[PDB]
Amino acid sequence: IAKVIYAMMGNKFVVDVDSNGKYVWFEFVLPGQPMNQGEIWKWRKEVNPDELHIYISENFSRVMDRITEHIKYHLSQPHESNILNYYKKLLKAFERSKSKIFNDSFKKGVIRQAEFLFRQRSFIQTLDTNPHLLGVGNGVLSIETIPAKLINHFHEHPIHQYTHICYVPFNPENPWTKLLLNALQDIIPELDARLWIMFYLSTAIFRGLKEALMLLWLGGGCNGKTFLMRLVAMVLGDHYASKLNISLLTSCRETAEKPNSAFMRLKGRGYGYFEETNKSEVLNTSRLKEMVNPGDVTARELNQKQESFQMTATMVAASNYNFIIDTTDHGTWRRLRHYRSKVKFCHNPDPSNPYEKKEDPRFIHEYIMDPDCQNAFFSILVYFWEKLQKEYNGQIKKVFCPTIESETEAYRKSQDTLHRFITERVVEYNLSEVVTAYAEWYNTNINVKRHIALELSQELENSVLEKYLQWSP
Amino acid sequence: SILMLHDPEARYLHKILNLLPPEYYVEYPLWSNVVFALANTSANYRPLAEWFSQKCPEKWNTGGKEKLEKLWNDASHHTEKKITKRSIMYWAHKHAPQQYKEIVEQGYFSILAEYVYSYNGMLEHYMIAKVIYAMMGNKFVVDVDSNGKYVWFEFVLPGQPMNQGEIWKWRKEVNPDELHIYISENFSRVMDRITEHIKYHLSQPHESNILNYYKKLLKAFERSKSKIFNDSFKKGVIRQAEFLFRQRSFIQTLDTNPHLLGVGNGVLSIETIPAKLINHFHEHPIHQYTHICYVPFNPENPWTKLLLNALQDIIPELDARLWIMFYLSTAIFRGLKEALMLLWLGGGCNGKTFLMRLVAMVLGDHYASKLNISLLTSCRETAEKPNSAFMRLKGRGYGYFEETNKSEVLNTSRLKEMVNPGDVTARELNQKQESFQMTATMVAASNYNFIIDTTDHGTWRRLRHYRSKVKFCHNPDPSNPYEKKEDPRFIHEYIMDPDCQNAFFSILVYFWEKLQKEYNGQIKKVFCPTIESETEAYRKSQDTLHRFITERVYNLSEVVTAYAEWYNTNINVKRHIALELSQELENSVLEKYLQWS
Amino acid sequence: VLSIETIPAKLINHFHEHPIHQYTHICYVPFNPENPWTKLLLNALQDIIPELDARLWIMFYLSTAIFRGLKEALMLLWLGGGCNGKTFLMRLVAMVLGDHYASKLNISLLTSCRETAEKPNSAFMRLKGRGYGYFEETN
DNA sequence: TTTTTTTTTTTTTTTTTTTTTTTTTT
DNA sequence: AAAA
Ligand SMILES: Nc1ncnc2c1ncn2[C@@H]1O[C@H](COP(=O)(O)OP(=O)(O)NP(=O)(O)O)[C@@H](O)[C@H]1O
Ligand SMILES: Nc1ncnc2c1ncn2[C@@H]1O[C@H](COP(=O)(O)OP(=O)(O)NP(=O)(O)O)[C@@H](O)[C@H]1O
Ligand SMILES: Nc1ncnc2c1ncn2[C@@H]1O[C@H](COP(=O)(O)OP(=O)(O)NP(=O)(O)O)[C@@H](O)[C@H]1O
Ligand SMILES: [Mg+2]
Ligand SMILES: [Mg+2]
Ligand SMILES: [Mg+2]
């Protein structure tokens, strides 16, 4: 009967072995059956195939009764004597065996036996591999072509991980879409900066390898940073987006034999964001290099073995203060595009000051939990992704947003210690006394730690201390 | 009208349905509800819902002629509101008390009859499960927890052995003991009915060689009857019935909407003014609760008068008491709130502990709890360790800090995340890391002033400072209106008394309703000049830069260095740093004489 | 089971219905001054603390230990030279109350300042349900 | 300093079931 | 008395 039930429901169930070595059950969800919200047309994990138990205890009885009536018809026909005794014994044995189908231990044994028949090798590792398929609230969405195609019928793609947001085509006539666009315009005054920020945010849906980049942008109170960041992170969903701990970025090495359990928060996550900060946390200029590089990183989670996965996420950090970078190598400064907010909200806006507006607390307290606004925002995101795809090729380091590069260059000029001393207390012989003066000045001001690189006789001297400067001993 | 013939269970639904009074077909608001229920139960048999709509209930002349289009668009009903057939059964039980049981005993006897007839006397671990689910399908529910093991929830009814204040609420059971008793107590009479039916059919002489059949059948059923009381058989039946009772999407919907409170005599709803107590069935899923009964706020109660006078004796101001009560009243709400936090200090024995402890105990353990001050006074711990005493904030509504020390600096990094309408992530002991929606009203108690080293608008947007005025002494002196005599009965008793807790809960819900009707809902709308005047005075202090400028004062490089002597010799010593003063003083009053060169 | 609901305190040496599980191994008898042990203890108590008013409060303070409900915000500390009997009296109280109701607490809880939020500690967990505690500091 | 212990690591499974089962029909 |  395990063989028969596999022949009956072979196209709806599949079994594979997980990492720990325990068989698990997956079933295809179809319309017209009880289910969790927004998990239609997708594979669903099943600890015990209770649907299979119900099927074997309900529908199999029809086939069993059909066999009973077939035996009855064969017995009723005129026949010999020995044949009739054989058929009577057959019917007796068959009914005694039929009585067993409703037993519990027998059903468990049948499930155990059918675990082998339903098994399909290379299924767990093939789940959610291609980053062009997204599980949405009403099916699965494909961004393989332009425009994106929504699949709401039967398919065979192994999709298990989804979000609870339905998808509709981008329509600017929707009241929610117009309200959201107006609020977005009010948040970011400059056109080029707004376009660049939307282009950067729109890549969060794509879960493949991306260009090594990161956005830092700060401001005062009531700037809308948390509103937009939380809106993105929540419209993507828990599975695809998550919040990250600032200590995971600002701290030092974690000991090699200690499991992290927080680094895995981005394992397969397409988007992550940092919320808070103190006065001045020195940026680690490491433990971020791998999380930004389109490469592979390794770590160990709770009570598991050492494992490695590929870095695929979009990162953005919000702050009320500037970070401390204390490095000048081209590797770190290739990334870290920097922005500064200009709009400011206070309950009593000052006239004749365009950089000042009134709050609408209904943006935070409500308008976020409402599904329709989230659907409109998802439409905005997918439209922006397809726009970035149709032009500019696919690379994001091609859009002309001179404000962002100018601000990044200005931030680079600050926080850089190479010219600060040469401008304030240039002395004018291997600059040993000069480097000691550098260190004593920066201490308790720019760099509280004594300089240990002897790098002032290197690309540092090639920066501003050249020409007249001499280094012969 | 032929789809009802596809299955008798829909015919039993119709038998329940015709018991419904015809008055339902009129006054539409409580007519569309049954349509909602029948639609959300399953869309396959929706034509039965249309059949009921056109069934000619009451009269066709009430505007329902040739069916109404309010039904056609109701076929979508793509919302989240949930009403099930349990409400229909409860309504059918409301009318005709002597008809529901006698009409469901058909079905009860039926299903068992077909099962015992098709498979002779043999009974296994699914037929019993199906019949049991047919009997009590409303009192129990099963869903999978996070760890992947099935759990059992039982609805609680009046007149039942139960814990205090668990009425009309779901309870968590490791094993359905009530069901283990029901399967062996009330099923027995059903089996006895089956046996007496068999005996009655045996008594009537039908024909030869078939009364023999009603001897093998009787012997088999007699053998199978005793299997109910067997322990292993009951365990198998429970295991198999776990699937029938399963209800998908139930764990994540438990205690979600912040407008429902579980109280000692039901569930409290604050969706509509005035708040309505629920004491009849209902369908909303509530598991957590408080052991405090709820009564409407009546000032004539002696305890209410005493408590109001005690409140009057603690906060001399009138605007200040209103603001404090309004802020505290948000503790009942468990949704997104304004990013605000109140911290207030004063002399010893001022009753702040009394008020905070009273609020915490009135709300209960599930909704409110105390929090350690180390979350404020210490730096953030590294990401590898699993943090407890922080996820204690998960799902709560109110938390208070009472411990205090000498002059200490607030870590204004937890403050920006632990007072915020956003999302926070953490991880508890022996568990993975997850993020939980954050809702909590917080207040801080101390007798020594905190230290705030920042000046940005991000932190000062929140925070509100107050100073206690009255003072209790063992031997109060004459005059001194800010001095009064203690009543140790306020702490050592008057707070374990349930009636006082009920009165305080009534006061709190009344203040919530008052804040709801006027001032809209926002707390940054009530005008209490004293609180922000005191907050601004506090912000005038703790701002070392402006005080230094006023008290004592070429090149901008001479700044910071000149401030260092004041920073060390005065206003603490500490260690001197820069790269923040060069920006703050730049964006400050020191500009006219500032030497940019 | 000893009940102090109403004066005089009653001893329930027969069947009852209260849910009592924890206990001490000390039998209870009415206070009789004529018992030789009682006389010896009273004489030693009078020897240890001479002043009558000071002695009275001390005994009352000790009496409060039996109770396990909310008490007053009072803490007693008394100093002196060596060989004064403070350890004798405090240990006697701790032993007569028993382990379930009395315990000795480390002074490190008062000498140190505080452990951070994520430090699982003994953290006066001995105070969970215990009605008495003593330190005996020596530095 | 402080350093690492704690957290983890196991440790929580077995007791039914099964078996048999005498009887009961053959 | 042997098989279920
Ligand atoms: N476009 C907008 N128009 C009006 N009000 C807005 C707009 N965007 C946001 N708000 C409101 O402004 C307030 C500030 O929200 P929030 O994002 O928390 O401030 P923030 O500065 O980004 N976070 P923080 O920097 O930590 O203070 C909220 O009440 C929002 O509802
Ligand atoms: N309205 C009141 N009238 C009279 N006595 C009161 C009143 N409110 C409180 N008390 C008493 O005053 C004392 C102060 O108790 P408490 O709540 O601990 O104040 P407190 O300031 O929080 N304690 P502390 O942390 O040391 O300042 C208690 O004995 C209360 O019973
Ligand atoms: N009432 C008493 N009459 C006579 N001798 C007594 C009495 N009480 C105690 N002693 C004796 O005096 C000794 C000193 O008591 P003890 O408790 O050791 O002092 P202590 O201060 O608590 N311990 P230490 O701090 O090391 O001196 C006891 O060991 C007894 O032998
Ligand atoms: Mg924000
Ligand atoms: Mg107090
Ligand atoms: Mg001693």
PDB file of N, CA, C and O in Angstrom, chain B residues 183-224:
ATOM      1  N   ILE B 183     -13.249  10.668  26.271  1.00  0.00           N
ATOM      2  CA  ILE B 183     -13.222   9.506  25.390  1.00  0.00           C
ATOM      3  C   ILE B 183     -13.668   8.242  26.110  1.00  0.00           C
ATOM      4  O   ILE B 183     -14.125   7.292  25.466  1.00  0.00           O
ATOM      5  N   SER B 184     -13.565   8.208  27.438  1.00  0.00           N
ATOM      6  CA  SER B 184     -13.925   7.028  28.207  1.00  0.00           C
ATOM      7  C   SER B 184     -15.200   7.192  29.021  1.00  0.00           C
ATOM      8  O   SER B 184     -15.741   6.186  29.493  1.00  0.00           O
ATOM      9  N   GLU B 185     -15.695   8.417  29.202  1.00  0.00           N
ATOM     10  CA  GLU B 185     -16.899   8.646  29.995  1.00  0.00           C
ATOM     11  C   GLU B 185     -18.146   8.796  29.129  1.00  0.00           C
ATOM     12  O   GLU B 185     -19.112   8.047  29.294  1.00  0.00           O
ATOM     13  N   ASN B 186     -18.143   9.757  28.207  1.00  0.00           N
ATOM     14  CA  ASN B 186     -19.336  10.057  27.428  1.00  0.00           C
ATOM     15  C   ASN B 186     -19.439   9.243  26.146  1.00  0.00           C
ATOM     16  O   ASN B 186     -20.528   9.144  25.571  1.00  0.00           O
ATOM     17  N   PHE B 187     -18.332   8.664  25.675  1.00  0.00           N
ATOM     18  CA  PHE B 187     -18.404   7.754  24.536  1.00  0.00           C
ATOM     19  C   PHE B 187     -19.078   6.441  24.918  1.00  0.00           C
ATOM     20  O   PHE B 187     -19.668   5.764  24.060  1.00  0.00           O
ATOM     21  N   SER B 188     -18.997   6.073  26.198  1.00  0.00           N
ATOM     22  CA  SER B 188     -19.531   4.795  26.650  1.00  0.00           C
ATOM     23  C   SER B 188     -21.035   4.711  26.431  1.00  0.00           C
ATOM     24  O   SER B 188     -21.549   3.665  26.025  1.00  0.00           O
ATOM     25  N   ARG B 189     -21.761   5.799  26.698  1.00  0.00           N
ATOM     26  CA  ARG B 189     -23.202   5.769  26.476  1.00  0.00           C
ATOM     27  C   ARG B 189     -23.539   5.673  24.993  1.00  0.00           C
ATOM     28  O   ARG B 189     -24.547   5.061  24.629  1.00  0.00           O
ATOM     29  N   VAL B 190     -22.708   6.250  24.123  1.00  0.00           N
ATOM     30  CA  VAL B 190     -22.921   6.086  22.687  1.00  0.00           C
ATOM     31  C   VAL B 190     -22.751   4.625  22.290  1.00  0.00           C
ATOM     32  O   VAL B 190     -23.554   4.071  21.523  1.00  0.00           O
ATOM     33  N   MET B 191     -21.706   3.973  22.804  1.00  0.00           N
ATOM     34  CA  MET B 191     -21.532   2.555  22.505  1.00  0.00           C
ATOM     35  C   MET B 191     -22.674   1.723  23.080  1.00  0.00           C
ATOM     36  O   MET B 191     -23.100   0.734  22.473  1.00  0.00           O
ATOM     37  N   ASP B 192     -23.180   2.105  24.253  1.00  0.00           N
ATOM     38  CA  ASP B 192     -24.331   1.412  24.824  1.00  0.00           C
ATOM     39  C   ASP B 192     -25.563   1.578  23.944  1.00  0.00           C
ATOM     40  O   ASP B 192     -26.362   0.647  23.797  1.00  0.00           O
ATOM     41  N   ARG B 193     -25.741   2.767  23.365  1.00  0.00           N
ATOM     42  CA  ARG B 193     -26.830   2.973  22.416  1.00  0.00           C
ATOM     43  C   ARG B 193     -26.673   2.070  21.201  1.00  0.00           C
ATOM     44  O   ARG B 193     -27.654   1.499  20.709  1.00  0.00           O
ATOM     45  N   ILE B 194     -25.443   1.925  20.707  1.00  0.00           N
ATOM     46  CA  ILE B 194     -25.202   1.018  19.584  1.00  0.00           C
ATOM     47  C   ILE B 194     -25.578  -0.411  19.966  1.00  0.00           C
ATOM     48  O   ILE B 194     -26.235  -1.130  19.201  1.00  0.00           O
ATOM     49  N   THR B 195     -25.166  -0.839  21.163  1.00  0.00           N
ATOM     50  CA  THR B 195     -25.469  -2.197  21.609  1.00  0.00           C
ATOM     51  C   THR B 195     -26.969  -2.418  21.744  1.00  0.00           C
ATOM     52  O   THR B 195     -27.483  -3.473  21.355  1.00  0.00           O
ATOM     53  N   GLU B 196     -27.687  -1.447  22.309  1.00  0.00           N
ATOM     54  CA  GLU B 196     -29.128  -1.614  22.467  1.00  0.00           C
ATOM     55  C   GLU B 196     -29.840  -1.592  21.121  1.00  0.00           C
ATOM     56  O   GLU B 196     -30.845  -2.287  20.948  1.00  0.00           O
ATOM     57  N   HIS B 197     -29.334  -0.821  20.156  1.00  0.00           N
ATOM     58  CA  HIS B 197     -29.879  -0.880  18.803  1.00  0.00           C
ATOM     59  C   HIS B 197     -29.683  -2.264  18.195  1.00  0.00           C
ATOM     60  O   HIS B 197     -30.595  -2.812  17.560  1.00  0.00           O
ATOM     61  N   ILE B 198     -28.496  -2.845  18.387  1.00  0.00           N
ATOM     62  CA  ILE B 198     -28.237  -4.190  17.879  1.00  0.00           C
ATOM     63  C   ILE B 198     -29.168  -5.197  18.542  1.00  0.00           C
ATOM     64  O   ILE B 198     -29.724  -6.082  17.881  1.00  0.00           O
ATOM     65  N   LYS B 199     -29.356  -5.076  19.858  1.00  0.00           N
ATOM     66  CA  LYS B 199     -30.259  -5.975  20.571  1.00  0.00           C
ATOM     67  C   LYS B 199     -31.692  -5.829  20.076  1.00  0.00           C
ATOM     68  O   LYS B 199     -32.410  -6.825  19.922  1.00  0.00           O
ATOM     69  N   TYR B 200     -32.130  -4.593  19.833  1.00  0.00           N
ATOM     70  CA  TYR B 200     -33.482  -4.363  19.339  1.00  0.00           C
ATOM     71  C   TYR B 200     -33.676  -4.998  17.969  1.00  0.00           C
ATOM     72  O   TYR B 200     -34.705  -5.631  17.706  1.00  0.00           O
ATOM     73  N   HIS B 201     -32.695  -4.839  17.078  1.00  0.00           N
ATOM     74  CA  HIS B 201     -32.800  -5.482  15.771  1.00  0.00           C
ATOM     75  C   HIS B 201     -32.733  -7.000  15.881  1.00  0.00           C
ATOM     76  O   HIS B 201     -33.322  -7.705  15.055  1.00  0.00           O
ATOM     77  N   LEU B 202     -32.019  -7.520  16.881  1.00  0.00           N
ATOM     78  CA  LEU B 202     -32.019  -8.960  17.117  1.00  0.00           C
ATOM     79  C   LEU B 202     -33.390  -9.442  17.575  1.00  0.00           C
ATOM     80  O   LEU B 202     -33.825 -10.538  17.202  1.00  0.00           O
ATOM     81  N   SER B 203     -34.078  -8.639  18.391  1.00  0.00           N
ATOM     82  CA  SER B 203     -35.350  -9.068  18.962  1.00  0.00           C
ATOM     83  C   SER B 203     -36.398  -9.311  17.882  1.00  0.00           C
ATOM     84  O   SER B 203     -37.142 -10.296  17.941  1.00  0.00           O
ATOM     85  N   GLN B 204     -36.474  -8.429  16.896  1.00  0.00           N
ATOM     86  CA  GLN B 204     -37.459  -8.580  15.831  1.00  0.00           C
ATOM     87  C   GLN B 204     -37.096  -9.767  14.948  1.00  0.00           C
ATOM     88  O   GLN B 204     -35.983  -9.805  14.407  1.00  0.00           O
ATOM     89  N   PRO B 205     -37.982 -10.747  14.775  1.00  0.00           N
ATOM     90  CA  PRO B 205     -37.665 -11.874  13.890  1.00  0.00           C
ATOM     91  C   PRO B 205     -37.703 -11.474  12.425  1.00  0.00           C
ATOM     92  O   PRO B 205     -38.779 -11.256  11.859  1.00  0.00           O
ATOM     93  N   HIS B 206     -36.531 -11.369  11.801  1.00  0.00           N
ATOM     94  CA  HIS B 206     -36.449 -10.986  10.396  1.00  0.00           C
ATOM     95  C   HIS B 206     -36.484 -12.209   9.483  1.00  0.00           C
ATOM     96  O   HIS B 206     -37.393 -12.352   8.660  1.00  0.00           O
ATOM     97  N   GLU B 207     -35.509 -13.102   9.634  1.00  0.00           N
ATOM     98  CA  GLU B 207     -35.384 -14.291   8.801  1.00  0.00           C
ATOM     99  C   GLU B 207     -34.286 -15.163   9.392  1.00  0.00           C
ATOM    100  O   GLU B 207     -33.544 -14.743  10.283  1.00  0.00           O
ATOM    101  N   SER B 208     -34.197 -16.391   8.887  1.00  0.00           N
ATOM    102  CA  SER B 208     -33.115 -17.277   9.276  1.00  0.00           C
ATOM    103  C   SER B 208     -31.808 -16.839   8.616  1.00  0.00           C
ATOM    104  O   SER B 208     -31.786 -15.994   7.717  1.00  0.00           O
ATOM    105  N   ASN B 209     -30.706 -17.400   9.117  1.00  0.00           N
ATOM    106  CA  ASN B 209     -29.344 -17.190   8.625  1.00  0.00           C
ATOM    107  C   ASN B 209     -28.961 -15.714   8.546  1.00  0.00           C
ATOM    108  O   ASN B 209     -27.940 -15.367   7.943  1.00  0.00           O
ATOM    109  N   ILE B 210     -29.754 -14.844   9.163  1.00  0.00           N
ATOM    110  CA  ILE B 210     -29.370 -13.450   9.343  1.00  0.00           C
ATOM    111  C   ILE B 210     -29.436 -13.007  10.796  1.00  0.00           C
ATOM    112  O   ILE B 210     -28.738 -12.050  11.166  1.00  0.00           O
ATOM    113  N   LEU B 211     -30.247 -13.654  11.638  1.00  0.00           N
ATOM    114  CA  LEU B 211     -30.092 -13.478  13.077  1.00  0.00           C
ATOM    115  C   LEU B 211     -28.758 -14.039  13.546  1.00  0.00           C
ATOM    116  O   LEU B 211     -28.208 -13.580  14.553  1.00  0.00           O
ATOM    117  N   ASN B 212     -28.229 -15.033  12.829  1.00  0.00           N
ATOM    118  CA  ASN B 212     -26.868 -15.491  13.080  1.00  0.00           C
ATOM    119  C   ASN B 212     -25.864 -14.382  12.801  1.00  0.00           C
ATOM    120  O   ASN B 212     -24.872 -14.232  13.525  1.00  0.00           O
ATOM    121  N   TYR B 213     -26.102 -13.597  11.747  1.00  0.00           N
ATOM    122  CA  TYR B 213     -25.247 -12.450  11.459  1.00  0.00           C
ATOM    123  C   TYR B 213     -25.275 -11.450  12.609  1.00  0.00           C
ATOM    124  O   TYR B 213     -24.224 -10.942  13.031  1.00  0.00           O
ATOM    125  N   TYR B 214     -26.465 -11.177  13.151  1.00  0.00           N
ATOM    126  CA  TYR B 214     -26.560 -10.385  14.374  1.00  0.00           C
ATOM    127  C   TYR B 214     -26.321 -11.234  15.610  1.00  0.00           C
ATOM    128  O   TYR B 214     -27.023 -11.106  16.615  1.00  0.00           O
ATOM    129  N   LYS B 215     -25.334 -12.096  15.551  1.00  0.00           N
ATOM    130  CA  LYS B 215     -24.681 -12.736  16.680  1.00  0.00           C
ATOM    131  C   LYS B 215     -23.173 -12.648  16.554  1.00  0.00           C
ATOM    132  O   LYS B 215     -22.495 -12.343  17.536  1.00  0.00           O
ATOM    133  N   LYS B 216     -22.640 -12.841  15.345  1.00  0.00           N
ATOM    134  CA  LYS B 216     -21.237 -12.537  15.097  1.00  0.00           C
ATOM    135  C   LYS B 216     -20.977 -11.049  15.265  1.00  0.00           C
ATOM    136  O   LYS B 216     -19.974 -10.651  15.873  1.00  0.00           O
ATOM    137  N   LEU B 217     -21.873 -10.209  14.737  1.00  0.00           N
ATOM    138  CA  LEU B 217     -21.703  -8.770  14.908  1.00  0.00           C
ATOM    139  C   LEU B 217     -21.740  -8.386  16.382  1.00  0.00           C
ATOM    140  O   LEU B 217     -20.912  -7.592  16.848  1.00  0.00           O
ATOM    141  N   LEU B 218     -22.689  -8.952  17.133  1.00  0.00           N
ATOM    142  CA  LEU B 218     -22.799  -8.632  18.552  1.00  0.00           C
ATOM    143  C   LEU B 218     -21.574  -9.102  19.325  1.00  0.00           C
ATOM    144  O   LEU B 218     -21.068  -8.381  20.192  1.00  0.00           O
ATOM    145  N   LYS B 219     -21.082 -10.308  19.030  1.00  0.00           N
ATOM    146  CA  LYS B 219     -19.894 -10.809  19.710  1.00  0.00           C
ATOM    147  C   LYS B 219     -18.679  -9.939  19.412  1.00  0.00           C
ATOM    148  O   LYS B 219     -17.902  -9.609  20.317  1.00  0.00           O
ATOM    149  N   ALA B 220     -18.503  -9.553  18.146  1.00  0.00           N
ATOM    150  CA  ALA B 220     -17.370  -8.707  17.787  1.00  0.00           C
ATOM    151  C   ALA B 220     -17.450  -7.351  18.476  1.00  0.00           C
ATOM    152  O   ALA B 220     -16.444  -6.845  18.986  1.00  0.00           O
ATOM    153  N   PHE B 221     -18.642  -6.747  18.511  1.00  0.00           N
ATOM    154  CA  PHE B 221     -18.766  -5.448  19.163  1.00  0.00           C
ATOM    155  C   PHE B 221     -18.565  -5.560  20.669  1.00  0.00           C
ATOM    156  O   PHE B 221     -17.982  -4.663  21.290  1.00  0.00           O
ATOM    157  N   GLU B 222     -19.045  -6.647  21.278  1.00  0.00           N
ATOM    158  CA  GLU B 222     -18.806  -6.859  22.701  1.00  0.00           C
ATOM    159  C   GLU B 222     -17.318  -6.995  22.986  1.00  0.00           C
ATOM    160  O   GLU B 222     -16.820  -6.474  23.990  1.00  0.00           O
ATOM    161  N   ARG B 223     -16.592  -7.700  22.116  1.00  0.00           N
ATOM    162  CA  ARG B 223     -15.144  -7.791  22.272  1.00  0.00           C
ATOM    163  C   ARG B 223     -14.487  -6.423  22.129  1.00  0.00           C
ATOM    164  O   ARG B 223     -13.557  -6.091  22.874  1.00  0.00           O
ATOM    165  N   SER B 224     -14.956  -5.615  21.179  1.00  0.00           N
ATOM    166  CA  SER B 224     -14.311  -4.339  20.889  1.00  0.00           C
ATOM    167  C   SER B 224     -14.675  -3.235  21.872  1.00  0.00           C
ATOM    168  O   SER B 224     -13.976  -2.217  21.919  1.00  0.00           O
TER     169      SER B 224
END
